[PDB]
């Protein structure tokens, strides 16, 4: 799985352990080994949500399977919780786009997963 | 809706109110309330279009509905126009990817829109 | 086609001419003229892969057609090879997401390809 967070919070406010915390929590939530999880955090962005530049986040989660109606509601609770606690972002200023990837459409280690 | 602009134009050339303008224009074009519109502008990027590093942009628009043949032409005229007027990017050096998102695949405030 | 590379390798390690090389190699691999290829390289990113911050990359390739099972294997060998040779990134620390875009969902030059 790969998880991307784009946010206007400054780099100095991103805790040093945040990428490792996300990796472990996503491994538990998805049931996948941590070795397969990639995380990308992009702070200091020029962003607005609802016309306001108060802290916000635009996120994406891509996974081969483990995406769906009930699962995505659970992921949204987990991730809004982490963003609220660690980055101080209000949960109504977070969007998360979920992508169920076909194995033939994910490249890794010179090949694809198909 | 969520609109992202990645561009090699320098940050100093982005006008002060550009995020507000995009928000209002997108609200009018999509018919969705400004409260739910997120905009993200990423300048100073290392980009090329057709092998050249003249000003260019790669953009994405994600929406739950309001995506389709005729609507997307209208959005492209609006958005290429704004980027040409405000950032001085030629419209033939802009790509905009459009994504019709399933409501179950957009997380917000501890749930999804399904 | 549009190709995006996000990496934690520093900007100073990106060779002169890399965006040209990517444009030329992707034109050959996809069969599309170079004029319609856009490339975007994002170094110095805060990223982890498998809970480690050793060099890694998250990439996307979006094309109108020319995406599929066997083609994506060929692209992954090509692109993992280039990232390994030019940026010193191990292929097992690269994900590439492939997107087959409908022509009606790509805006360019004030219109769409539909």
* Contact indicator for C44, C55 with CB cutoff of 8 Å: no
* Neighbouring subunits of B (3+ Cβ pairs under 8 A): A, C
* Contact indicator for A37, A28 with CB cutoff of 8 Å: no
* Contact indicator for C9, C18 with CB cutoff of 8 Å: no
CA distance A40 to chain C (A): 4
E-assigned strand segments in chain B: 2-7, 38-42, 46-49, 57-63, 94-100, 106-108, 111-112
Give chain C's largest Cα–Cα span: 43
Smallest CA–CA distance from B43 into chain A, residue: A46
CA distance A11 to chain C (A): 10
Q: Distances from the Cα of C99 to the Cαs of A60, C61, C64, C68, in angstroms?
A: 15, 6, 8, 9
Q: Which among C112, B2, C72 is positioned nearest to A48, based on CA atoms?
A: B2
Spatial CB neighbours of B101, under 8 Å, sequence gap ≥ 6? A97, B62, B63, B64
Q: Which among B56, B42, B37, B52 is positioned nearest to B94, based on CA atoms?
A: B56
For residue B111, what is the DSSP state?
E
Which 3 state secondary structure label does DSSP give B65? coil
How far apart are alpha carbons A108 and A16 in whole angstroms?
Answer: 27
* Neighbouring subunits of C (3+ Cβ pairs under 8 A): A, B
CA atoms within 13 A on the CB side of A5: 31
Strand partners, B59: B5, B96
Strand partners, B39: A48, B3
Each as own residue / partner, the long-range contacts of residues A14-20 (CB below 8 Å, 24 or more positions apart, any chain) are A14/A41, A14/A43, A14/A86, A14/A87, A14/C46, A15/A86, A18/A86, A18/A87, A19/C46, A19/C47, A19/C48, A19/C51, A19/C53, A20/C48, A20/C51
* Contact indicator for A48, A56 with CB cutoff of 8 Å: yes
* Contact indicator for A22, A39 with CB cutoff of 8 Å: yes
Please provide the DSSP assignment of A20-85 as one string: HHHHHHHHHHH---GGG-EEEEE-S-EEEETTB-SS-EEEEEEESS--SHHHHHHHHHHHHHHIII
Pairing of strands A57-63, A2-7: antiparallel
* Contact indicator for C76, C85 with CB cutoff of 8 Å: no
- Annotated binding site of A for substrate, which residues? 32, 64, 97
Structurally, chain A folds into a number of domains equal to 1
The answer to whether B64 is annotated as binding is: yes
Strand partners, B3: B39, B61
Q: Are B95 and C37 a contacting pair at CB < 8 A?
A: no
Which 3 state secondary structure label does DSSP give B20? helix
How far apart are alpha carbons B108 and B72 in whole angstroms?
Answer: 24
Which 3 state secondary structure label does DSSP give A14? coil
Q: Does the beta carbon of A68 lie under 8 angstroms from any beta carbon of chain B?
A: yes
State which residues form the domain around B94: 1-114
| Entry resolution (Å) | 1.6
Find the catalytic residue in C1, C10, C15, C33: C1
């Amino acid at each position: 799985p790969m998880f991307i967070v784009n946010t206007n919070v400054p780099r100095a406010s991103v805790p040093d352990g945040f990428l490792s915390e996300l990796t472990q929590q996503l491994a538990q939530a998805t049931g996948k080994p941590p070795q397969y999880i990639a995380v990308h955090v992009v702070p200091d962005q020029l962003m607005a949500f609802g016309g306001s530049s108060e802290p916000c986040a635009l996120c994406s989660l891509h996974s081969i399977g483990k995406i769906g109606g009930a699962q995505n509601r659970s992921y949204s609770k987990l991730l809004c919780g982490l963003l609220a606690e660690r980055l101080r972002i209000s949960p109504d200023r977070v969007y998360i786009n979920y992508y169920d990837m076909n194995a033939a459409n994910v490249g890794w280690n010179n090949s694809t997963f198909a």
